């Protein structure tokens, strides 16, 4: 794909091939905590990951995806703003070249060192590619990363990056438990938005957790050793793969707390 994160193919250029980039419900956005409103109508959030079945980790040239078996209801997200059930298909991260940047969402303009996206699709639509064509097709659980204490549940991921350094490399990644990536609190903000990479489809109910997880400097440093390029090509570090905040336009961010 032509698009990327650089001066010549980055976020400011995406609109020429994906005009929806200048659309009415684009992501990420800045979350202004003073204007987000508590919504008592929100039902309790349900993150049911006990039977999660991970498969593989892939360096796709832009980030790395950990993929799950979504053939059945094994890891699902329910409740909150959501109706019906949403199946986990993959997670990935966005991160920075420095600790003061890397997240996509911001909180009162605050940028975190990274941001985890747990991507889920609405089972009523039967497969992922159909769901992304629906305004309520996806639900993405967003979790901020700050640098501090190591996150033990992340270390298996960090441990395998060595084996997928370059674009197109994949590795077995079975028996990984995403519950180890969750903070204590499931207090969130929610708004309707989009994929944050091309094709930028406006199909996501965003659920962004208030509580960040802490990871260590050594953990984040290993993220930054990945490569955008393919094997045997000149090295370009995989850093700053985040889209900046987009205009909120006619949307309201709701708080669960
Ligand atoms: S989403 C990132 C897409 N790939 C690149 O922008 C790139 C730049 C330089 C070397 C390899 C790949
Ligand atoms: Zn993402």
Ligand in closest contact with the CA of 62: 1
Could you tell me if 199 and 20 are in contact, meaning their C-beta atoms sit under 8 angstroms apart? yes
Q: Output the six-digit token pair for 114.
A: 């990274």
List the Cα angle 79/108/99 in 5-degree steps. Answer: 95
Q: Closest by alpha carbon to 96, among 247, 226, 183, 248?
A: 226
Give CA–CA dist 196/85, Å, rounded: 22
Distances (CA, A) of 169 to 27, 57, 140, 156, 212: 28, 9, 25, 17, 29
Establish whether residue 198 lines the binding site of ligand 1, counting it when its CB lies within 6 angstroms of any ligand atom.
no
- CB atoms < 10 A from the CB of 217, how many? 12
Q: Give 237's DSSP letter.
A: B
Give CA–CA dist 126/123, Å, rounded: 5
Establish whether residue 242 lines the binding site of ligand 1, counting it when its CB lies within 6 angstroms of any ligand atom.
no
Distances (CA, A) of 92 to 68, 89, 200: 12, 11, 16
Could you tell me if 82 and 139 are in contact, meaning their C-beta atoms sit under 8 angstroms apart? yes
Establish whether residue 6 lines the binding site of ligand 1, counting it when its CB lies within 6 angstroms of any ligand atom.
yes
The alpha-carbon radius of gyration of the chain (Å, integer) is 17
- To which residue do tokens 């298909």 refer? 89
Q: Closest by alpha carbon to 201, among 30, 13, 23, 12?
A: 23
Ligand in closest contact with the CA of 3: 1
**CA-closest residue to ligand 1 atom 10:** 229
Domain range annotation of the chain: 1-257
Q: Which of 229, 234, 239, 242 to mutate to test the pocket of ligand 1 (most atoms within 8 A of CB)?
A: 229
Q: Which of 1, 3, 6, 13 to mutate to test the pocket of ligand 1 (most atoms within 8 A of CB)?
A: 6
Give the atom of ligand 1 at the shortest distance from the alpha carbon of 62.
Answer: 1
What distance in angstroms lies between residue 63's CA and the mean position of ligand 2's atoms? Answer: 9
Sign of CA dihedral 198, 202, 207, 212: positive
What 3-state class would DSSP assign to 123?
A: helix
Give CA–CA dist 14/210, Å, rounded: 29
**CA-closest residue to ligand 1 atom 11:** 229
Resolution attained, angstroms:
1.7
Establish whether residue 229 lines the binding site of ligand 1, counting it when its CB lies within 6 angstroms of any ligand atom.
yes
Q: How far is CA 254 from the centre of its chain?
A: 19
What distance in angstroms lies between residue 94's CA and the mean position of ligand 2's atoms? Answer: 6
Give the strand pairing for 37-38 and 64-68: unpaired
Burial of 224 (0-12, 13-18, 19+ CB in 10 A): middle
The CATH T-level fold of domain 1-257 is: Carbonic Anhydrase II (3.10.200)
What 3-state class would DSSP assign to 152?
A: helix
Q: Output the six-digit token pair for 32.
A: 């202004």
Q: Closest by alpha carbon to 122, among 114, 112, 113, 132?
A: 132
Give the strand pairing for 76-79 and 86-95: antiparallel
Distances (CA, A) of 231 to 1, 165, 235, 239: 17, 8, 9, 17
- Which secondary-structure segment (H or E) carries 38? strand 37-38
């Amino acid at each position: 794909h032509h698009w990327g994160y650089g001066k010549h193919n980055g976020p400011e250029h995406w609109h020429k091939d994906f005009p929806i980039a200048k659309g009415e419900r684009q992501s990420p956005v800045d979350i202004d905590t003073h204007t987000a409103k508590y919504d008592p109508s929100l039902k309790p959030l349900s993150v049911s990951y006990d039977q999660a079945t991970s498969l593989r980790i892939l360096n796709n040239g832009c980030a790395f995806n950990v993929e799950f078996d979504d053939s059945q209801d094994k890891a699902v997200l329910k409740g909150g703003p959501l109706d019906g059930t949403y199946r986990l298909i993959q997670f990935h991260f966005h991160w920075g070249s420095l600790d003061g940047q890397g997240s996509e969402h911001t909180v009162d303009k605050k940028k975190y060192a990274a941001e985890l996206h747990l991507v889920h699709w609405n089972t009523k639509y039967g497969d992922f590619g159909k769901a992304v064509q629906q305004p309520d097709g996806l639900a993405v659980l967003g979790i901020f990363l700050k640098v501090g204490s190591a996150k033990p549940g992340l270390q298996k991921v960090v441990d395998v990056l060595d084996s997928i350094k370059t674009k197109g490399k994949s590795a077995d990644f079975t028996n990984f438990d995403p519950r180890g990536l969750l903070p204590e609190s499931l207090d969130y903000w929610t708004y309707p938005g989009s994929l944050t990479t091309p094709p930028l489809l406006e199909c996501v109910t965003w659920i962004v957790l208030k509580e960040p997880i802490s990871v260590s400097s050594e953990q984040v440093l290993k993220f930054r050793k990945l490569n955008f390029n393919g094997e045997g090509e000149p090295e370009e570090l995989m850093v700053d793969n985040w889209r900046p905040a987009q205009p909120l336009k006619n949307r309201q961010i709701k708080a669960s707390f």
